[PDB]
From Swiss-Prot:
It comes from Yellow fever virus (strain 17D vaccine). Displays three enzymatic activities: serine protease, NTPase and RNA helicase. NS3 serine protease, in association with NS2B, performs its autocleavage and cleaves the polyprotein at dibasic sites in the cytoplasm: C-prM, NS2A-NS2B, NS2B-NS3, NS3-NS4A, NS4A-2K and NS4B-NS5. NS3 RNA helicase binds RNA and unwinds dsRNA in the 3' to 5' direction. Also plays a role in virus assembly. Forms a heterodimer with NS2B. Interacts with non-structural protein 2A (via N-terminus). Interacts with NS4B. Interacts with unphosphorylated RNA-directed RNA polymerase NS5; this interaction stimulates RNA-directed RNA polymerase NS5 guanylyltransferase activity. NS3 interacts with host PDCD6IP; this interaction contributes to virion release. ATP binds at residues 14-18. It is found in: Host endoplasmic reticulum membrane. This is Serine protease NS3. Residues 3-149 form the Helicase ATP-binding domain. The record marks 257, 260 as: Involved in NS3 ATPase and RTPase activities.
Amino acid sequence: SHMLKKGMTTVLDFHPGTRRFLPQILAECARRRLRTLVLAPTRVVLSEMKEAFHGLDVKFHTQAFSAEVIDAMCHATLTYRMLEPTRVVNWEVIIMDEAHFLDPASIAARGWAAHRARANESATILMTATPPGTSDEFPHSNGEIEDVQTDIPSEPWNTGHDWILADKRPTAWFLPSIRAANVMAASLRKAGKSVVVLNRKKPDFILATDIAEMGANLCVERVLDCRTAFKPVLVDEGRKVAIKGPLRISASSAAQRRGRIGRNPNRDGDSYYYSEPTSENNAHHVCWLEASMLLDNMEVRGGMVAPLYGVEGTKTPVSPGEMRLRDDQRKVFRELVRNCDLPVWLSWQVAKAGLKTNDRKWCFEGPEEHEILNDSGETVKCRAPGGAKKPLRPRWCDERVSSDQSALSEFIKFAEG
């Protein structure tokens, strides 16, 4: 009942299925004239807020926050302004929608918002059906759900899975990779089905690798779940970032994938098919340390140190405050992540070293074991600073910059300029 009181932290575990409650809690924020911050996990959810808030006086920051008692923005848009030594904003209420996403900016924002609550500067409200620290693969739903443990193919099949296409309800299918989704998509369309592939009108199939691109608009009665995903994992005693998979997903991630169906109280019998078990052993995933780096470098009133939120403090391998940088170090760290589209972990390695954004030498002073290949198997090479064609070796290896042709291409454009 004291949601909007400074010092209060409140988790709201509404059944899935932004359009009803959030407009109301913002209204009382307006009547109380409390400076409110509304955080969204994705640009999709942020756009749905624009429609849901049309009768409200809310400032949306769809690109930057460089300047109305309610502010609405994405987690990343908040994290990156906090990386600058700038004017602190006394947000008295902080509301986070879908406070369960596990990208580093989302995690660090939870610890940031949770810190302002403990510091008595803000009231913090987290909204998610799967709060952090919950590990239940089958939580409550509005309508009853049919759970089925069964073998689900990852590649197209010519025998033994009649039940998939024999069901006619609109279906969402979570697959390990976009490559698998694209391959599967063509095989389902040659089978006569309508397919839509979500990536960076009702189809018979919607294929995606996560729930990030899915708004509340999506209408689906059945979910197939490979329950796997590739992840950026820390390897080699934590001095390299490698991509590994297909790995198991956590119980909350499977609960969120399953949460796409069962949203109607009137409709029972929605079906969720899965095979793989889940796993919570993910402390070696790089996103926790990347969340620490970000949070241990976001501006806070008083310059104080904050741990990650709740159970997410157990997952990070460092200790609160450990990844803080000097301001001159940090501005390269902020500039490299924001405008050069480089992984958070890698950008922190250059800032701890002391190099500068326009200097691209570190792309070259690396050992040959750090050399990057291509899809055809050859070793790529590009222009070093000064026009010298010198070989491409990162001083710190982060396999995210060479995961596909699109990655190392744009990583080369970073090396050349």
